Design a protein around this ligand. Structure first.
Ligand SMILES: CCCCCCC/C=C\CCCCCC(=O)OC[C@@H](O)CO
Ligand SMILES: CCCCCCC/C=C\CCCCCC(=O)OC[C@@H](O)CO
Ligand SMILES: CCCCCCC/C=C\CCCCCC(=O)OC[C@H](O)CO
Ligand SMILES: N[C@@H](Cc1c[nH]c2ccccc12)C(=O)O
Ligand code: NA
Ligand code: NA
Length: 433
């Protein structure tokens, strides 16, 4: 039921866009290994943790901590999630803006054939433009603010009820097609033959733990909100697995679509954020009716991004209504404008503001992404796990998580109580050296 809504949030640009350029510049299979290891040992338990919290509390993220734990400082994760909601959405609307621009050019037929400067140069010229991405960012943000304020979200999960299975099938089709382009052995080995020297590098673990929290909509309390509006019929840990498995499925299939085509096109896997925006247009170009494939793919991906951005904007909006007694439309608009303003310099980091560094060695886009995804999400996720692991009580924890008198229940508690917090902790200390 409402578990589909959680998948609507989980599956988005993190599965196709982010997963690609993070996996690419981090070795590939070695990264993927750690990534898959984190979803299992850290991801799924914490996803189940957020479901458990919301379902008992029957409230929003930050409100859940106060109801379950009045006055206790456990709510610092919820507050940290609010800040992450601002940061992540700020640049998320920028990448989603890129999708709408690419959608437009397939509608006008400008991307049907390769431009004079090539698809790479086309994307370069677009993001180097100071004001052209800003329009499409605003256009996407306005649509997000619109849906959140009006509260019309059944336009959204009737969408991910049809459009998301369509996205999955399309990706499966494109993944198979990409393997025929002549870079299959190079692509699969990159993705599934681990380089053990990369496991020497602590930064790989931090990138994997970041992608894990990002792709699962985890660490900021977005899933806590979904869990509150889940009836008690529903076995939560099956939901947590199904959510994690489906999202993992979307990402891995996307990798099989991208990287074989990357080596086929003779591109670098460490290309950057615009990797997919260079590969896909040429794949579609190799297809005779590829413009139609292109139009369909960016309509579907845009839908997935929209349903994820609504999920993102909801976290600060729901908070500001609980704390400052704002109306839904007021909160959505005000925060919407602020977040969009916050996204402008981030979008300019691909152009005239490329020289600016905030985090040492990282531009504005990478800095915001770092602070939100590599710091806030796993730190907040740690606190959430610690909350159930130590702050809760096993009897209540297992009761809500539908894992009473089970071996999985003890295994789940063990994850949240030690294995997950220590793993995130170890990654932190090793990375910050
Ligand atoms: C809703 C029904 C199923 C979905 C659509 C069915 C098509 C799925 C996969 C088709 C992939 C075709 C790949 C093979 C191919 O055409 O190779 C051509 C070759 O010349 C290109 O290098
Ligand atoms: C009922 C249909 C719904 C619309 C869904 C979107 C359509 C997806 C793909 C359109 C047709 C693709 C055909 C493949 C193709 O043109 O390959 C030919 C070329 O590569 C070889 O000569
Ligand atoms: C109907 C969408 C409204 C978007 C405009 C909101 C203004 C605030 C921030 C976005 C700034 C971008 C507007 C300028 C613009 O149209 O650029 C177009 C391209 O540069 C065309 O070459
Ligand atoms: N999971 C989504 C992005 C997302 C939506 N809500 C979130 C909350 C927290 C972290 C990430 C998200 C994606 O992969 O595209
Ligand atoms: Na995802
Ligand atoms: Na989505």
């Amino acid at each position: 039921g409402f578990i589909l809504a959680a998948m609507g949030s989980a599956v988005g640009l993190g599965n196709i866009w982010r997963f690609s350029y993070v996996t690419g510049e981090n070795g590939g299979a070695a990264f993927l290994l750690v990534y898959l290891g984190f979803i299992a040992l850290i991801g799924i338990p914490i996803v189940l943790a957020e479901f458990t919290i919301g379902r008992r509390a029957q409230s929003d993220a930050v409100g859940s901590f106060e109801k379950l734990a009045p006055g206790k400082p456990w709510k610092v994760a919820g507050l940290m999630g609010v800040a992450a909601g601002f940061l992540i959405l700020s640049f998320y609307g920028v990448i989603a803006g890129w999708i709408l621009f690419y959608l437009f050019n397939y509608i006008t037929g400008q991307l049907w054939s390769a431009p004079a400067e090539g698809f790479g140069g086309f994307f370069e010229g677009f993001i180097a433009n100071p004001t052209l991405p800003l329009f499409w960012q605003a256009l996407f943000m306005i649509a997000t603010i619109w849906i959140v304020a009006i509260g019309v979200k059944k336009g959204i999960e009737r969408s991910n009820k049809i459009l998301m299975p369509l996205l999955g099938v399309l990706l499966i089709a494109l993944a198979i097609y990409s393997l025929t382009l002549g870079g299959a052995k190079e692509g699969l080995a990159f993705l599934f033959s681990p380089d053990w020297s990369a496991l020497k590098d602590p930064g790989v673990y931090l990138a994997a733990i970041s992608q894990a929290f990002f792709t699962l909509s985890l660490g900021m309390g977005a899933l806590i909100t979904y869990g509150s509006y889940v009836s008690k019929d529903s076995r939560l840990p099956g939901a947590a697995v199904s959510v994690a498995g489906l999202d993992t499925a979307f990402a891995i299939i996307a990798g099989i679509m991208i990287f074989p085509a990357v080596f086929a096109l003779g591109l670098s896997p460490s290309g950057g954020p615009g990797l997919v925006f260079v590969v896909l247009p040429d794949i579609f170009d190799s297809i005779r009716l590829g413009p139609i494939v292109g139009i369909a793919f960016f309509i579907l991906l845009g839908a997935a991004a929209l349903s994820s951005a609504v999920s993102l904007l909801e976290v600060p909006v729901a908070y500001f209504m609980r704390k400052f007694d704002w109306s839904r439309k007021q909160a959505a608009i005000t925060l919407g404008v602020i977040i969009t303003l916050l996204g402008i310099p981030s979008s300019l980091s691909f152009g005239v503001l490329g020289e600016v560094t905030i985090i040492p060695g990282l531009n504005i886009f990478d800095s915001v992404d770092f602070i939100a995804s590599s710091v806030f999400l796993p730190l907040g996720g740690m606190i959430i796990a610690l909350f159930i692991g130590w702050g809760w009580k096993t009897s209540d924890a297992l009761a809500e998580s539908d894992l009473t008198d089970s071996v999985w229940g003890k295994l789940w508690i063990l994850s949240l109580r030690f294995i997950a917090p220590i793993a995130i902790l170890i990654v932190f200390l090793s990375a910050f050296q």
